[PDB]
Amino acid sequence: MSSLLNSLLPEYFKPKTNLNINSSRVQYGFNARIDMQYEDDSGTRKGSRP
C-alpha cells in the first residue's frame, strides 16, 4: 500500500528515484538548527547550535 507508507515520510523530504546501497548499515537523520535561551536566579544567557 504505497499511498499509506508514502504519507509517513516528513513533508520537507521528497526522495529521488535511485539509491546505490553498498553496505549492510545505513544512518538516516536530519541537520537541524537549535536556538536555546537560558534564564535562572544568577542571570540570563543566550546561545545557538548551528
Partner 1 sequence: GRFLYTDVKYEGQTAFLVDMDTVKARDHCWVSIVDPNGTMNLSYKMTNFR
In this complex, which beta carbon is closest to a second copy, that of residue 25 or of residue 33?
33
Residues lying near a second copy in the complex (CB under 8 A): 12-14, 30-31, 33, 41-46
Q: Are 27 and 21 in contact (CB under 8 A)?
A: no
| 35 touching partner 1, by CB under 8 A | yes
Q: Of the two residues 16 and 46, which places its CB atom closer to partner 1 in the complex?
A: 46
* 37 contact choice in a second copy, partner 1, none (CB below 5 to 8 Å, kind-dependent): partner 1
- The three cell numbers locating residue 3: 499511498
Instruction: From 48, 19, 21, 18, select the one nearest 36 (Cα to Cα).
Output: 48
